[PDB]
């Protein structure tokens, strides 16, 4: 179990750690989060009391270094940093732990929610979507735009998701115009899976990472990427049976976890009704369809 210690908490902030969150008052005695499960990526995120605008945060894996949070009063945010002096980190962490100034990552032992939301998400891939190679952790916020969004302005602060575009020469073989547009299997299996992602795990990892940036930061561009990658599979007549079964599990847990009162904005009516009720895979997402129909039957 690992620890993200905090130097202090000078401004009132709502802190999120994975799917959990808690309030810290201005100058409350708070020195971070302990007992974080090793083996998964994590995200620690922030919403200032005074400006619910801008939710920002950091994707990290404790196996890749010792990380801590200290507020920067010049740039005005809680910044993630790496302590390279391991002994000092241990002395500092042990001191905060003995004074019981840390909250405990509150994992119920029955609960596989976080694993299920991040099963294919790997920090090395996140760092290729979020380019900032001098840090081992990756910052994301509400306003960051995607590479595709910039095609339609600062490239260094962009989310370099894989560009999917159903009306593109990439997606459409000459002389298969109708075939390739109504049945995207070529674009899924050959262009994207075999060509770009190499395997379905990397595909699912980007898909899960897009959803999570949507949910935790309201990063519109991620929301668009998530739906696009769902729709590409659903609109493909030929999908490996294992990918379909895995996709059903993936989406089930995404829909299960989504805050009920965010479903209006996040969830795209056209994509879901198409995927569940018109597409080739309309019969292949039993779990996802059952939870969607019992939880958000308005949307359908």
């Amino acid at each position: 179990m690992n620890t993200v210690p905090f130097t202090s908490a000078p401004i009132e902030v709502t802190i999120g750690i994975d799917q959990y969150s808690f309030n810290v008052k201005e100058n409350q005695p708070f020195h971070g989060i302990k007992d974080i499960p090793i083996g998964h990526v994590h995200v620690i995120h922030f919403q200032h009391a005074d400006n619910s605008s801008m939710r920002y945060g950091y994707w990290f894996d404790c196996r890749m270094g010792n990380f801590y949070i200290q507020y920067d009063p010049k740039d005005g945010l809680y910044k993630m940093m790496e302590e390279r002096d391991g002994a000092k980190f241990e002395n500092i962490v042990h001191n905060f732990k003995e004074r019981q100034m840390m909250v405990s990552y509150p994992k119920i032992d029955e609960d596989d929610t976080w694993y299920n939301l991040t099963e294919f998400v790997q920090m090395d891939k996140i760092r290729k979507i979020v380019r900032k190679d001098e840090n081992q952790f990756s910052y994301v916020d509400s306003s960051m735009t995607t590479v595709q969004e910039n095609e339609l302005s600062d490239p260094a602060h962009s989310l370099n998701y894989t560009v999917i575009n159903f009306k593109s020469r990439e997606a459409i073989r000459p002389g298969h115009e109708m075939e390739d547009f109504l049945d995207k299997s070529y674009y899924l299996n050959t262009v994207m899976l075999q060509g770009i992602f190499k395997n379905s795990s990397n595909y699912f990892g980007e898909l899960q990472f897009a959803f999570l940036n949507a949910m935790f930061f309201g990063n519109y561009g991620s929301s668009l990427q998530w739906h696009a990658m769902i729709e590409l599979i659903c609109s493909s007549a030929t999908v490996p049976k294992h990918m379909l079964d895995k996709l059903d599990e993936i989406l089930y847990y995404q829909i299960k976890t989504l805050p009920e009162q965010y479903s209006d904005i996040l969830l795209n009516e056209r994509v879901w009704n198409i995927c569940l009720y018109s597409s080739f895979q309309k019969n292949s997402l039993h779990n996802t369809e059952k939870i969607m129909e019992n939880k958000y039957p308005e949307l359908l």
């Binding site: 009306k167 115009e177 109708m178």
Partner: protein
């Protein structure tokens, strides 16, 4: 964006453009089978592609052989239309290619966009206008060449005959649409009007009679009455 009442005059500027109408591509007769079921028999169709400034009509005949062994024919008809339009554009020298294609039905937008990915500089546009191009098969000579075709074929017409020698393209387009609106609302009357003169002639190389300026006013007036009339007989007004 969409072509409508408010940007109507754009059709007659000097940017090459085409209307594409697909309403007559997939045509069928519905009939009873020996067992008392219903079946369809395809008959030849056409794509109506029209330059509204010049009146050049690129009438691609869709022969029934193109449907053989195919499923979902109404959907294929839209892609087949898109395929033939994009072949036409590819056959033209760059400086003759349209800058815009305007489709009369929104369901053509995705099929044409996809077939035209190689031409990102050609705007594919819908319209809010209820244009009467479906009545193009009420023009006898057009209907005749379509029904007689035994293979795929492109036939070229000027749908304005020689009108542009005397009137502007705006006024020729407006006459065309009146004539076709009339033909669509009551083909028999419409044709009775046009062919009401036993002494008037349609030239071998034309589609419509050789009316004088004054005779066209009379004709155009009679076609307006028809459209108002049938609007009564259909609405009891």
């Amino acid at each position: 964006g969409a072509m409508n009442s408010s940007n109507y005059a754009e059709l007659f500027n000097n940017d090459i453009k085409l209307f594409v109408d697909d309403t007559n591509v997939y045509r069928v007769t519905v009939h009873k089978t020996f067992e008392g079921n219903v079946a369809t028999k395809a008959i030849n169709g056409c794509i109506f592609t029209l330059n509204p400034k010049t009146g050049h009509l690129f009438l691609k005949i869709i022969h029934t052989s193109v449907w053989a062994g195919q499923k979902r024919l109404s959907q294929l008809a839209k892609w087949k239309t898109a395929e033939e339009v994009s072949a036409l554009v590819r056959s033209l020298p760059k400086e003759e290619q349209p800058k815009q294609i305007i489709v009369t039905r929104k369901a053509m937008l995705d099929p044409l966009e996809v077939h035209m990915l190689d031409f990102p500089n050609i705007a594919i546009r819908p319209t809010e206008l209820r244009l009467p191009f479906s009545a193009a098969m009420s023009i006898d000579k057009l209907s005749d060449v379509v029904m007689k075709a035994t293979e795929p074929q492109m036939v070229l017409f000027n749908i304005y005959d020689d009108w542009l020698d005397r009137i502007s393209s705006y006024t020729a387009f407006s006459r065309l649409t009146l004539l076709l609106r009339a033909l669509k609302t009551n083909e028999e009357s419409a044709k009775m009007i046009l062919l009401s003169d036993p002494t008037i002639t349609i030239k071998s190389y034309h589609l419509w009679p050789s009316f004088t300026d004054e005779q066209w006013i009379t004709i155009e007036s009679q076609m307006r009455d028809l459209i108002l009339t049938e609007y009564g007989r259909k609405y009891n007004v």
